[PDB]
Structure 1
């Protein structure tokens, strides 16, 4: 790793969306990669992030090598960043817990399972259980 040059094109500040945004030009000239968490840290130290409420996602690698291009945002207010930004990139960043759920097909199966069943449902279940007994 000779050096990183992580430059801002189009430095625009939005109080509405509560950030400073730009285009992240990572000259990572021969290093190995782009390494997005180290890049979180650098953009934090250059403007201010305290990395958690940065948002950089799209450092795609140029041909001939050594350059990556993407976008960067630096929100304020870590809880604002939480509210605004999406659980999936949040758990990518690791500051979240991504949940365990069955598949869309499993959930639509459950919907069909449900779709026979009017009313509270215990009233359905209890009487059919008495019946299944006898």
Structure 2
């Protein structure tokens, strides 16, 4: 409800298609305002017609309480987010939803297929 945001070492990265910055969150006598409210506040700041181009990670609460630190990341459009962000991040945000679990028992199939020959292999 009553929190403040301080953005530090802001940088623009045209090689990628994003902006890069560090973050500090102030919330006295309360605990750990959630990620959604932070996203909404950032969107209001940069006018950010949508909220699906923002990535946040690495949030720590600083023993004693009342403040929090982390990192942020804002992309030009959702196409860039999908293009060059890794898969686990892209699953936490919810842009995609894939959970294939082939497993590292594929090693057994790797091995016992080397002993068969051209046709049956």
Paired positions, count: 120
Q: What are structure 1's unaligned runs of at least 5 residues?
A: 126-134
**Structure 1 vs Structure 2 CA RMSD:** 1.8
Question: In 2, Cα distance between the equivalents of 1:6 and 1:28?
Answer: 9
**TM-score for the superposition, normalised by structure 1:** 0.78
Larger relative contact order, structure 1 or 2 (CA cutoff 8 Å, min sep 6): 2
| 1:124 corresponds to 2:95 | no
Q: What are structure 2's unaligned runs of at least 5 residues?
A: none
In the superposition, relative to structure 1, how do residues 6 and 124 fare at CA in structure 2: closer, same or farther (>3 Å)?
A: same
Which of the pair is proportionally richer in strand? Answer: 2
Aligned-pair distance for 1:48?
A: 4.0
**TM-score for the superposition, normalised by structure 2:** 0.85
- Residue 112 of structure 1 aligns to a residue whose secondary structure is helix
The structure with the largest alpha-carbon Rg is 1
Aligned-pair distance for 1:30?
A: 3.6
Question: In 1, Cα distance between the equivalents of 2:16 and 2:28?
Answer: 33
Which of the pair is proportionally richer in helix? Answer: 1
